[PDB]
Amino acid sequence: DIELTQSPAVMSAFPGEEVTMTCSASSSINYMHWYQQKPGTSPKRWIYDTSKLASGVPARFSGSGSGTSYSLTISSMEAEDAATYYCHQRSIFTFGSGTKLEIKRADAAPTVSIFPPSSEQLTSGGASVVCFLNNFYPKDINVKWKIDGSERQNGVLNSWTDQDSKDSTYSMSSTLTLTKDEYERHNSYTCEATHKTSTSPIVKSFNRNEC
Amino acid sequence: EVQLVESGGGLVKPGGSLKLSCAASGFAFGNYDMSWVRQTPEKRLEWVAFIGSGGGRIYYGDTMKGRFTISRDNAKNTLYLQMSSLKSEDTAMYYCTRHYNYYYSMDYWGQGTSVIVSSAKTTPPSVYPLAPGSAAQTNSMVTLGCLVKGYFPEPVTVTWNSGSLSSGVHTFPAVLQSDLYTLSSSVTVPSSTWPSETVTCNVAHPASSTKVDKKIVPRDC
Ligand SMILES: C[C@]12C=CC(=O)C=C1CC[C@@H]1[C@@H]2[C@@H](O)C[C@@]2(C)[C@H]1CC[C@]2(O)C(=O)CO
């Protein structure tokens, strides 16, 4: 069969830059289509028949290519252009895996806060310690948990938001889930964020034996 | 004008069956070839089935293996997909689409209907208030939260003060934990306003018909 690969998987750019992404076919085909998708909504026809713009698509966009190689190009990119773009063609079962275009902005350190397990959760026999890292840039950030002075790595789950549609920052939660008995065996809980904005981490902590 | 509106998706045990429908409006439905496209949890898009305008020409995607049947009723402006012997790998959002010309771009898409194939059962969430407690903050702002734990299937919808606190809110994508979903939501308000002004998270889980409010109250230390 014929299969599609897209490059790059993820890219980011400031508004005003030129953007190019590529779609490659394992064997020659023609009349490539491109679909735009944003979080929570359906794919949308964007370019079709290799180079025709769909209705509502600005002339900053163009498609081109032939044979085994195709591309979508954006001049003077705008914030609303941020999306995942997928290629597809009439003899292809699986769409290309998509290029996710993200918005570059000024670096920002996270606002960090930590929360002890609630008494209601303890009553049921679980204990989640929740740490929020809000409104930071870029997306790459490292979170480290220390329990009574020693690094802890099991039972941590992290979840990032999509890039924020108004200020282009990212937020993320880091949650340490323990049993109530495991939580009750230790006292000092620390959440540390290490981000490229500073060589020294941002630290929030609490002692279980307070409050 | 043109509308494509899917339905019939839901939770189904492995080996089970389901029928999806797509209601069409605003165009001469019988002049157009139609398709089903699905998007997997990994965001991968797969062409499932295609039907010609007359219903006499049909194609299926590679991994379907005869378990899918596309059909249409041009009199009722409805497209169908019958799915049987369902597998874990059939979990996806299923989209109704319309074709433009004979290079087969898809010029209109429906809103999608979600199909989830597993043995897990519908389960309501536990909701817990996140007050600073022994981690009390000291800025001009304070951040509070709600922990939503142990529900199935997705989604839940989280609001703060019935939607009147909308800025300063981050609701994080849910993750599987012991094969049930968990998420947290944070809200940030001026520290002069809490606790003098109440802050409450509103959690709705439609699949279980559950709705709960958790007031964020300072902990009794
Ligand atoms: C254009 C096409 C071929 C000729 C035709 O009269 C109508 C179509 C539309 C459906 C396309 C089909 C083939 O190309 C094979 C496809 C891609 C099928 C959709 C699934 C498909 O059966 C497949 O995925 C095979 O790999």
Compact summary:
The complex is a heterodimer of chains A (211) and B (221). Chain A has helices at residues 119-123, 180-184; strands at 4-7, 10-13, 19-25, 33-37, 44-48, 52-53, 61-66, 69-74, 83-88, 99-103, 111-115, 126-136, 142-147, 150-152, 156-160, 170-179, 188-194, 202-207. By secondary structure, chain A is mainly beta.
What is the CATH topology assignment of the largest domain in chain A? Immunoglobulin-like
Q: Specify the number of helices of chain B.
A: 0
Give the topology string of chain B: H per helix, E per strand.
EEEEEEEEEEEEEEEEEEE
Domain count of chain A: 2
Shape verdict of chain A: elongated
Strand fraction of chain A: over 45%
Q: Could you estimate the helical fraction of the residues of chain A in percent?
A: under 10%
Major sheet attributes of chain A: 6 strands, mixed
> What's the end-to-end separation of chain B, in Å?
59 Å
What does this structure look like?
The complex is a heterodimer of chains A (211) and B (221). Chain A starts with a strand and ends with a strand. A 6-stranded mixed β-sheet of chain A has the order 2-10-9-4-5-6, with no helix packed on it. A 4-stranded antiparallel β-sheet of chain A has the order 1-3-8-7, with no helix packed on it. In chain A, strands 11-12-16-15 form a 4-stranded antiparallel β-sheet. Chain A is elongated. With 211 residues, chain A is mainly β. Helix content of chain A is 5%, strand content 49%. Chain A contains 2 helices and 18 strands. Chain B is an all-beta fold and 221 residues long. Helix content of chain B is 0%, strand content 49%. Chain B is elongated, with a radius of gyration of 23 Å. The chains are: A mainly beta (211), B mainly beta (221). The complex binds prednisolone (TUA).
List the helices and strands and how they pair.
The complex is a heterodimer of chains A (211) and B (221).
Chain A lengths: L3 E4 L2 E4 L5 E7 L7 E5 L6 E5 L3 E2 L7 E6 L2 E6 L8 E6 L10 E5 L7 E5 L3 H5 L2 E11 L5 E6 L2 E3 L3 E5 L9 E10 H5 L3 E7 L7 E6 L4
Chain B lengths: L2 E5 L3 E2 L5 E8 L8 E6 L5 E7 L6 E3 L7 E6 L4 E6 L8 E8 L6 E4 L3 E5 L8 E5 L10 E11 L5 E4 L8 E3 L3 E3 L2 E11 L9 E6 L4 E6 L6
Parallel strand pairs in B: 2-11
Antiparallel strand pairs in B: 1-3, 3-8, 4-5, 4-9, 5-6, 7-8, 9-10, 9-11, 12-13, 13-17, 14-18, 15-17, 16-17, 18-19
The complex binds prednisolone.
